[PDB]
Every structure is written in C-alpha cells, then in structure tokens.
Amino acid sequence: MDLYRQSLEIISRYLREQATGAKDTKPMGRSGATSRKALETLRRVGDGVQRNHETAFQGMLRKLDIKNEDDVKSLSRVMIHVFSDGVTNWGRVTLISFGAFVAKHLKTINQESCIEPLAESITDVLVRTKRDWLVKQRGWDGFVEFFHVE
C-alpha cells in the first residue's frame, strides 16, 4: 500500500496530464522527491515511447476500439495476461506509455471520466503482479536511476 499509493499517484498524474495537456502541480505525497523525479523521468521516457511507437500504438488502439467506460474495464484481462507471462524489466514502462496513449484517446472521445479508473487498472496490474521485483529494484528510485540520462 506504500508502493501502491505512490505508483497510483505517479501513474494517475502522468495519465491525467497526458490527456488534458496541463501539468497538475499541487502535492508531493508518498516519498515526495522520489515521486517528483519518477513523474519527471516518466514524462521524458513515456513521451519518447509514445513518439517511437506511434504506428504500433495507433494500430493497437484502433484494434482495441475503445468507445465507452465498459470498454476501458474490459482492458484489464488483456493487460494482466500480457503484462505478466514473461520476463519483467523497466523497459516493459511501455505499459504506462501505452496507458498514457489510451488516456489521450479517452479525452478525445469525451471519456475523461475513465482516465482515473484506467490509471487504477494500470497500477493494480503493475504493483500487484510485480511488488517483489519492484521492492528489490528500490521501487521508483530504481525507475529514476535506470532512466537517468545527462
């Protein structure tokens, strides 16, 4: 729940700002500096993943044919099915970036009400299936470190 609330805040913020185009700047709950830095790496890396995977993401999004809230709920079984199954690494992030891509689509089709639930679906899939890996990787500090550039 420590890692969950922190992941939910980062993923939820990232998804909301990708959708609306407006950066939400208000609190720094659950390891404040780590979350600010996680959110920063996520918007640099996440935007790169969407840029470099526009064709795949557009293809997949069209295939998914998300029209309403119930279509967003149906996404979770595919999400769990694909996201687990094999090897886990920071690159596999693509999960969040694809989520941000879907969140953008959701704003476009007047389904902004599904962005927060989608963020919760992604966090549930991420934290509940990979907690042990995440804690061993020092959580979001690990994500920040792995993607640290300069």
Under rule CB under 6 A, residue 99 binds ligand 2UU: yes
Question: For ligand 2UU, how many residues bind (rule: CB under 6 A)?
Answer: 15
What part of residues 26-65 is at the interface with ligand 2UU (CB under 6 A)? 60, 63-64
The answer to whether the CB of 89 falls within 8 A of the CB of 44 is no
Q: Which stretch binds ligand 2UU (CB under 6 A): 13-21, 31-39, 92-100, 138-146?
A: 92-100
109 in contact with ligand 2UU (CB under 6 A): no
In the complex, minimum distance from the CB of residue 18 to ligand 2UU, in angstroms, rounded to a whole number? 12
Question: Is 78 one of the binding residues for ligand 2UU (CB under 6 A)?
Answer: yes
Q: How far is the CB of 24 from ligand 2UU (least distance, A)?
A: 20
Residues that bind ligand 2UU (CB under 6 A): 60, 63-64, 75, 78-79, 82-83, 92, 94-95, 98-99, 102, 122
